[PDB]
Design an enzyme around this catalytic site. Structure first.
Site, PDB file in Angstrom:
ATOM      1  N   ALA A 195       0.854  -1.191   0.000  1.00 39.38           N
ATOM      2  CA  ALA A 195       0.000   0.000   0.000  1.00 39.38           C
ATOM      3  C   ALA A 195       0.889   1.239   0.000  1.00 39.38           C
ATOM      4  CB  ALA A 195      -0.897  -0.012   1.214  1.00 39.38           C
ATOM      5  N   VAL A 245       4.518  -1.285   3.390  1.00 40.91           N
ATOM      6  CA  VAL A 245       4.383   0.125   3.022  1.00 40.91           C
ATOM      7  C   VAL A 245       5.228   0.454   1.791  1.00 40.91           C
ATOM      8  CG1 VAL A 245       4.656   2.528   3.753  1.00 40.91           C
ATOM      9  CG2 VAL A 245       3.811   0.816   5.373  1.00 40.91           C
ATOM     10  N   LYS A 246       4.574   0.959   0.745  1.00 43.50           N
ATOM     11  CA  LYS A 246       5.226   1.270  -0.528  1.00 43.50           C
ATOM     12  C   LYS A 246       5.699   2.727  -0.541  1.00 43.50           C
ATOM     13  CE  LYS A 246       4.399  -1.103  -4.927  1.00 43.50           C
ATOM     14  NZ  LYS A 246       3.565  -1.149  -6.164  1.00 43.50           N
ATOM     15  N   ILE A 247       7.000   2.913  -0.759  1.00 41.32           N
ATOM     16  CA  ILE A 247       7.668   4.212  -0.693  1.00 41.32           C
ATOM     17  C   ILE A 247       8.338   4.488  -2.052  1.00 41.32           C
ATOM     18  CG2 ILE A 247       9.559   5.509   0.421  1.00 41.32           C
ATOM     19  CD1 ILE A 247       7.329   4.980   2.384  1.00 41.32           C
TER      20      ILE A 247
END
Lengths: 212, 212, 212, 206, 212, 210, 212, 211, 207
Positions: free
Chosen positions: E57, E83-85
């Site tokens: 996400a 967590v997508k960064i």
């Protein structure tokens, strides 16, 4: 790669053992037949008294049942006796039966990787690909060692490779580089391996310098 | 590489087992259908009585729920029954469901590495790429073995490769060199593997020297 | 690589020729022997009437003098007759004598590069290494094609290679990649070379789109 | 590698021709469905223009091919890879008519076609890729066979789906690549080309 | 290589999961935005209810402080949230802070090996190189996978590679062969991977033979 | 590989030409802007250098590019017209080639672009090593690809390795088959130097002098 | 690769010539010394009467001026006489002198590539690297062939390589593959090259089928 | 690969030539300095005996003076080759001499960039130094491989002289890797003739021949 | 690759040891030409293997000499020439727990025989092979491959090292040890950019 001597001559075997280099012996029917007036089984007793490593002795019958009985008899001679079996369907049956009895086996007259793999899967302790005999009919015997080593390595087989039909020193270096566990060779080949002209020159120079 | 025999003929299977070389059996609907007067499930009982290793039996339905029920039925025949499932979407569903119940599976009719990876990630115990059928339409079947072996090795998959559609001895050596865990082949191919003209000639010479 | 058909059947030869792909024909004593009610020389007349390219006909004697006489007689039938000679010492004698008289030769039953080279150096127009027969005893026939092509290329020999004992489509692609000038194969193999499932699908789709 | 455009749409052909890049055109029954048109195309394009026969019977393919060849010198008759197709290719070749054998998916088919007299062979990259066989490897095989054996047969890389097919087909020795006009325009583009043009212009204008 | 599905569509995710093949999911802001009338966080709750593996996400802010707060918020949704960064300087600050909290991260928009290594050294659980987008501008996306595998293997990094921007079946086999731990792809690509014309033909012949 | 100097500075070009090594010159709008009239500068340069001298068009529209190229070509016979890699650029290159005017397509960053330029009629294509290097793609590998393509297909198109930053680009460009390398003067002078050369001169001189 | 016979035995030479394969002869002092009751020069007349190709005859003196005189005398016997000169400094002087007089030379006892290059640059027509003798002291003789071929090709030398000290069939195929222009070998090796067990079997089967 | 002898000594050059193997001669300022004879007189003696390239080095480091020295050297004999150090002034001198039709050998080359610059200045020969690179941990033989690849790919007729040859291993490798020429001391040349199996072979042949 | 110094000069050995780099010493009868007192001195200074060569060519006598040498210190290694009698001596000495170094090795067959007789070390000669046109470094590659494939613990000492290029290549190819003159060791420290870098660092540091 371990050194075995490929002969039935007791004096040759003693000489090889005295070199400090000898891990085993291979006899075959022809090698035994060229030695004059001694019993086969008595000869095996003499050899196994001298050599503690694997000593190969080949069955004569081509029938599985008879090979198994010959193998059980040979195995009683000494703990380091290895039973040599020819690569045939009946030979595979004999190898399986002998393995179940805890008797070591060496499948001989192997000329390709398919034969080597069958023998390994029947339970063979050793397989004996023939280098020189293949070379003479135009197929690279050394390439067979490479194939068999690759197959045994990839698949986790404990089967040991004996490079046999060794004719000259070039077979020995290449068999070792290609991964043959063992090379069996005539005494005369073993002696050739010790020699180099620069060793001869080096000895002379070292001694000349040492002696004033 | 382990040897499986690719047949539903009981006489052939018994012969292969007697060689001391047999790790398993594969059947398929065509191989089973060519045999006369005996029940499929009864034949499987006879086979698993003889062979302790994996014995593949293929489902008939193309619908996942029916495949699963067929597989659960086949698994009751004996503990070494492996359920053969065709490479389709429903097949992948059947493989996962059977794996969740502890039933071993072999996904068949695999012709590329994408299919093999899918089957593996569905839980397949074995995958069966077809060599000869690919060779015949101009794609190198043996190259598929190389691809699947590399994928399974790099990624730590315990999925086993069965090289299938084996037509001749050149398929066997290459499949073994390229890392197929298992090769399944007709009995005629297995007998071919034992043979070489220099093995014949060697036996003759050993025996002539031995006999005076 | 040129396509030759490996048969003595006139109907098969006519069919292959009608494909528009045929560069020659190989017959041998086995292929001729299986054919029913016709004279060898009459059959060769019919074949050379249909095919303009090389047509191989094999001698029967194993004695050089007699092989040479048979070759002279065969050459009278048609200018495209190529005399097939087995790889023996007497065969080399025959090849040289026939080459001196302007008669084309095809040395057959070659299983290694040593034989191929001797034949080339006796004057052979063609040499015929046997792929399948080698494969079956565990030596890669295709590797022989590679050896011979390398030797012929490096040494500027005009000898042409006929890949023979072709069993299947994988032999064809590989022989071509490896530089066999010619491949001789059964008619059934030639038909198999035309086929691919995406060709079938492409034809059906083109026609579905074209017809409304 | 020469650029052919894979379309029957005349507007796209003129557009491609105007780039100064067009060495020929390929049509096929699918592209067409969506003789006068061929006249138009061969007036615009000097290079090979491929037109596919409809019948699957050798005799009929040959007659269709003879008719197509009368339209212009650069007409190339497209023939499917079948036994009857090989017969047609040999007959047409003997009459001096150019041919392009299509629906080729392996090197055995390519070699048969070449030995029947084909001017061009058309291996299909994307269709092979989709069923898990490397289409580009087929280019490599056919190029090696043609070079080793001194064949003058030309390779047309077909079923080109994207820019990666183009670079690889060229590197592997495809004589020709045939592709949609869309792919051709995509080949011109790079973000550093865009950035470089902007920077050159900014510096030039004070 | 593990299969992830690259979508925010809940029906597609459920279908992929039903195949028995699904190890995870990747969403991103564009994939999420194309889905109609459901909140982002509610959608993530539905997905993580269905899929037990990693579910990516992506954060919206480009400031490190705000990314870290968004990430702590996403992490509370379910234990499998990743967590997508995006690959930026502030991104690396966020990855380090989240990693210190024990929160899993996936750094996206990677187009070279320098970026992949920076991300790995910041603490990233996963890195996502983009194949298709590189291919289109004339650089080989698959070669980037080979570089990142080689770097991670040599240096003992546990960072996982997600091959992203997968466009077709050829990307799948190559990414697997080159060592991508995971490939994330559209559902349509996953379906295409099941298919081959010889599988279809094989199923037809088995059934024909089975049914008399 | 031939040496071109990548500058609009007349003093640098004269110095490069005096070394005995110069086969050509490349200018570009940034190099020209940092320095006199543009066309007068091109006259000065082409008076000193007999080899190819690249001059870049300013417009992005093909018709205008063609007119600019025709004007540039009148300045001297060794004038080569630098065209950017765009769709209009390809149109411009084909037209100019039909008129017998030499061309150099610039801002090339992959082999698809280079092949297009070649098939449009380009005399030269200019891949950019350094700019590719900095965004993580190996510029030298692009040279390898374009050389292989041109060799395999019998194209006479010539490769100018551009965006050369240092001596390492020079050796590799040459090994990989760039026909030409264009570089700053400072790079050219660095190429002459090695510490064992310095040492060998000192030693030869000391031994010769008693 | 051309075939030369390495013997001074006139009967062996005649037999070799009769095969239709013989391109030349090499003799040496040991080979000539083992032949009883005929003079050196008379033997050379007999050999050159039969063989049209190069016939090598070795000088005895180790002094350049005397080698040159012996060579001039030898060359008068027939136009195809080639003067064999040992690899020494005086030998090089003789080679250049003889080359200036248009007499063909063959530099023998070559064991490394430095010697071969020197010999070539003195004007040698032929150089003779010794395979077997190098093999026996642990250095690969065939690798010397590869080095000398590479040097001669890269530098445009027309010097011809005679592979000498050939012991067996494996030397012949390898020397040919590696670019030796000529191999000189004992008659026994030449006859071994003709043979293969599948050639034997193929002849038998052809004749059986042919004769009903 | 051709053999040149790397010496100013007149006796050594005559011995080498007498072997039938000599294709040329290299002198340099250190090699000439170690000899009681005039330099230009020695060059006359050498070129009277040797037809192939004979290299003679300039002393000045200034381009104008190198050029004047080279023109003087060129008048001695047709096979005089002017040795020039790898410097900026050196490249100027090579181009000027090349325009006059005079042969040049650019010396003190330790990398492929220097070799290419020299080739493009018009150098007839370039002289990479094997042993001196080896001693500071860079493989001199790899430089030969590089330079040969560059000249081959680009159609340059420039010739490579492998210099700073220290031992027989440099000779076989330089030849395998494509050095057109190797220049070496006379001692190295005689060492190349020797092998223990050659000695043994001769003995055995003569033993069997003499009963 | 470990560094041994190939000399019997005690001053050279103490200098090499003082460098921080020394793992052992090889002597030989040429290099040496009271021996046992010198060996006592060397083994007091150097902790690693110190090779001392036997004089007799007869197995029984080599064994007695080896037993005497072994009493001097735990790190004494008995150097034995590659001959049939040498192999006998190596096996006897190995059975007595005494370390051995087989010298005058010029091919892989000799190296393998020596290993299988029990040798602790084998010493292939690089330069002597190079000079007769055979690549000495290729012998290192062969022996390393054989020892690795077969699980032999035998160690390779690259001997007849003539120059710095032998050192880098011997290390890359897997020689466990290289033995060389002290002169070669000091040459290995040098590079013109090291000299230039030191000068530049010092110039900047001093205003």
């Amino acid at each position: 790669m371990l050194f075995f001597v490929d002969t039935a001559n007791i004096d040759e075997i003693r000489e090889a053992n005295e070199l400090g280099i000898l891990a085993g012996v291979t006899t075959n029917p022809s090698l035994v037949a060229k030695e004059a007036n001694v019993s086969f089984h008595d000869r095996l007793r003499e050899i196994t008294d001298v050599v503690k490593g694997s000593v190969s002795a080949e069955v004569i019958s081509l029938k599985a049942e008879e090979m198994i009985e010959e193998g059980k008899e040979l195995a009683k001679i000494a703990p380091n006796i290895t039973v040599k079996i020819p690569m045939t369907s009946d030979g595979l049956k004999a190898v399986r039966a002998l393995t179940d009895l805890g008797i070591k086996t060496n499948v001989t007259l192997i000329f390709n990787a398919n034969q080597a793999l069958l023998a390994a899967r029947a339970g063979a302790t050793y397989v004996s690909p023939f280098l020189g005999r293949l070379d003479d009919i135009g197929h690279n015997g050394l390439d067979l060692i490479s194939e068999v080593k690759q197959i045994f390595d990839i698949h986790g087989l404990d089967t040991q490779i004996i490079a046999a039909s060794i004719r000259h020193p070039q077979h020995v270096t290449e068999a070792a580089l290609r991964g043959a566990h063992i090379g069996t060779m005539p005494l005369k080949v073993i002696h050739a391996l010790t020699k180099h002209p620069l060793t001869d020159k080096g000895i002379e120079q070292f001694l000349a310098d040492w002696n004033k």
